[PDB]
Ligand binder design. Sequence first.
Ligand SMILES: *[C@@H]1O[C@H](CO)[C@@H](O)[C@H](O)[C@H]1NC(C)=O
Ligand SMILES: *[C@@H]1O[C@H](CO)[C@@H](O)[C@H](O)[C@H]1NC(C)=O
Ligand SMILES: *[C@@H]1O[C@H](CO)[C@@H](O)[C@H](O)[C@H]1NC(C)=O
Ligand SMILES: *[C@@H]1O[C@H](CO)[C@@H](O)[C@H](O)[C@H]1NC(C)=O
Ligand SMILES: *[C@@H]1O[C@H](CO)[C@@H](O)[C@H](O)[C@H]1NC(C)=O
Ligand SMILES: *[C@@H]1O[C@H](CO)[C@@H](O)[C@H](O)[C@H]1NC(C)=O
Lengths: 149, 592, 50, 50, 50
Amino acid sequence: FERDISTEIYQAGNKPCNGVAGFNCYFPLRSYSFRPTYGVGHQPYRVVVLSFELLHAPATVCGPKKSTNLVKNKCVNFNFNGLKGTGVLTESNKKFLPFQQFGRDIADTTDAVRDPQTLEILDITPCSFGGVSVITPGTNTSNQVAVLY
Amino acid sequence: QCVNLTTRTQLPPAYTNSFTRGVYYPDKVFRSSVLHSTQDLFLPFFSNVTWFHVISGTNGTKRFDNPVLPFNDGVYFASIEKSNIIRGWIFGTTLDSKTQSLLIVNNATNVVIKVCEFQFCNDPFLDHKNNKSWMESEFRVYSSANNCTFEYVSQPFLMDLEGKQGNFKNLREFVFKNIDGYFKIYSKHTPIIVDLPQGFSALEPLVDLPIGINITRFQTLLALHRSYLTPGDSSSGWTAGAAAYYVGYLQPRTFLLKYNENGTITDAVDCALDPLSETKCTLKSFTVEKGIYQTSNFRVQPTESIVRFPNITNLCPFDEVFNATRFASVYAWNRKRISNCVADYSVLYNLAPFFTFKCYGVSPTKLNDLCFTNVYADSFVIRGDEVRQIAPGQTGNIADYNYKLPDDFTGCVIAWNSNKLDSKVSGNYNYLYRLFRKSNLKPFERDISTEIYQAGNKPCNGVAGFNCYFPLRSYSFRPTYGVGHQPYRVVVLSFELLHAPATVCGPKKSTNLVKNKCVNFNFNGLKGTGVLTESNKKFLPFQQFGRDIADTTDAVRDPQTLEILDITPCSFGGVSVITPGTNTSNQVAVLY
Amino acid sequence: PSKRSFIEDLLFNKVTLADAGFIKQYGDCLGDIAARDLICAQKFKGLTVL
Amino acid sequence: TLVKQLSSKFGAISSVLNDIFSRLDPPEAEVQIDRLITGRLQSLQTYVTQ
Amino acid sequence: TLVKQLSSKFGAISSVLNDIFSRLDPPEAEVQIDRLITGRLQSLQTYVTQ
Ligand SMILES: *[C@@H]1O[C@H](CO)[C@@H](O)[C@H](O)[C@H]1NC(C)=O
Ligand SMILES: *[C@@H]1O[C@H](CO)[C@@H](O)[C@H](O)[C@H]1NC(C)=O
Ligand SMILES: *[C@@H]1O[C@H](CO)[C@@H](O)[C@H](O)[C@H]1NC(C)=O
Ligand SMILES: *[C@@H]1O[C@H](CO)[C@@H](O)[C@H](O)[C@H]1NC(C)=O
Ligand SMILES: *[C@@H]1O[C@H](CO)[C@@H](O)[C@H](O)[C@H]1NC(C)=O
Ligand SMILES: *[C@@H]1O[C@H](CO)[C@@H](O)[C@H](O)[C@H]1NC(C)=O
């Protein structure tokens, strides 16, 4: 990703010509030869290269989609910018600095997030999970059990 | 326009210590109550900086207070002043108008950043008359308007937002760096201090722009103070004043940042500085209990690099292999031998635009450095729709009946189009192929036979009647036809690796052999690190490089002098640190 | 030498087949002579004995 | 056994890092290097366990 | 459980070698065979450890 516009005559190397446009001088700049009826390999072609770098900085493009009303205190799905997941999205008291956008924890999971429009900080907890251990008294006696979440 | 600058003064580069200064937030994320460990550009702890000083006041000499300073990988431009004079950083510029020149001129009516592709002048300095309004009437930094790329204005920047006090009001700190293509700037303002003061502080990021150019060195700038009181030259006729600024160069280092309950940085320890450091980092805590700890290993790094290759210069005959007027049939695929020559694969790129140089077991670009053994070359003509069919372990007619490749094939194919060469006016039928054979042939096996066989029992024995179909079928190869049914030319280059009898390879120039030094070596594509020493081991006349109990080479024969050497890692070991605790002392003993 | 008794002296000969590389210096085997026994070959791969 | 287990190819092109890095570009050398690294890590873990 | 873990895909197309080593091209079949054999070796090792 470096560009130069050095039009100065380039020294060939050993036995220099001192850049006097004489013998043993090499001119890097040359012109393309294009014809209406010519080889496909030498046929002109237009090339465009586009690049991008996903980062923690605020996004800029985020094209045509749908924006819905924000909900809190419910285990719901979210699609903040490109950040997807599931959580309750409660209120947070973390004092973000003006240049900070994303939160993070030990396991590199975004605990907090700043919404693009309302400009507020929201916590994230993946609601509730876990629970096992049906309790049975033996199958000759009865088919009645209890569950211990 | 611009005018030259005169009255240059040379002063010793006064140096002073920076006590744990120049630490910023690495990323735009929030953390708290974590001892996160980073790895980024930081100013090393306890390092001396080039303490520039603005001296020679009034109008005597005024000094050359704005010299050119190298910009290697970063800058820690600081400043202590009251009158707000030092401004105008010119960084990342070659100064010869090679490419874009960067300017940041502020404290005007509002902060502005000027970016233009102008042709630079011979001596820059930004004029400011001592009138009621201090305006840069003269632009001595540049005098051309060749091109302009970017312009930008910022309201909040570098203002001395404070009161009116006689002490040094502000201590500005800056960090200039290029993030692999774009420039990032950090800054902070420090209140009055009753000459870097001791303490800890963190820098909040600021605006960044791409630009992206070659970088030669950094240049600063000072506001002129030309007045009618003194008759002076146009080069330098302004009062000096008083100012002071520091410059430090950033280096890659590993730190251990500590965050507070606000998410703010409060402390950091610089690794690879002291023996008690890096074990304060291995423990990942700021307090170290007494005992013995193992931190890391110490190794002697190599200092040179040598290469040794066979001293043959004969060119390989790759012309007639590819410039052959007439190839042979597919079932008669014309095995060839290439040996005892220098092979350059760069000249091979000049062929037809339809080119399919795809390779297995070796990258197409790294053919030059390796050294092979008994490189082969196999030329034949194949149909257009069968160029993809010839592949390692691919089933089909041409692969299983005419040309079979091994599963662990090393080397690769070269395919170029032959639209007009192999097509006659009425078509070419010289090239044949075996449509029917008894069974699949073994890899790299050639069989040529035209005897009619008992295709449907009742052996013909030369009758060639019904139920007996001929084995050899020809090709049409129309002068104009579909690309799938148009003749192609293909050649396969099969070579055997493991490099016992190195014979050919390419253009690598030898270097004088050095011994008894931890050095790199490239003995015929056998890259490694170690020390070369004369060996008393007796090699038999046919014996090449030896081995040890493991599979690692221990001896190697010189390709030129034909002598046997030894290789061995030059140094390694372990390091332990003896510490009596952190609350009682800060001195340690190191056990190698 | 030392204060070993007779029975101990008998004992430290029957079973002491190998005392291992109890920290042997690099200069002991730096490629000189034949050498390259089991201890020195293992040390170059990082395995040491304290 | 730990020393001898260093010569296994682990289903790769070669058992030496330098040859693999010299004979292949990073896009395809990454897979071979990852295979070798994970094989040697699994080889090293069992010795610690025993 | 050691016997039962012999009929799992382990990240492949099928748990049967006949459908992997045969009726398919060499490279990816070899990759899948390597995956199967390394998984089975890991299972044997963990059984031995237990
Ligand atoms: C985004 O658009 C609508 C109305 O303009 C509304 O959700 C909100 O006010 C806007 N957000 C900002 C930050 O202006
Ligand atoms: C910094 O190190 C010492 C410390 O004062 C100083 O004498 C020296 O000139 C400075 N520069 C270098 C390269 O050591
Ligand atoms: C963190 O922020 C709270 C918010 O009021 C403040 O009271 C506290 O002093 C801050 N922590 C530190 C260590 O200053
Ligand atoms: C060139 O190679 C031959 C072959 O062994 C060798 O004898 C000779 O010394 C070499 N020449 C030089 C100048 O090294
Ligand atoms: C083969 O012929 C072409 C065209 O005549 C020529 O450019 C090339 O140098 C020759 N040799 C090789 C190896 O391609
Ligand atoms: C330092 O810490 C150790 C470990 O807790 C403690 O025993 C020792 O007394 C401390 N030194 C002091 C308090 O001076």
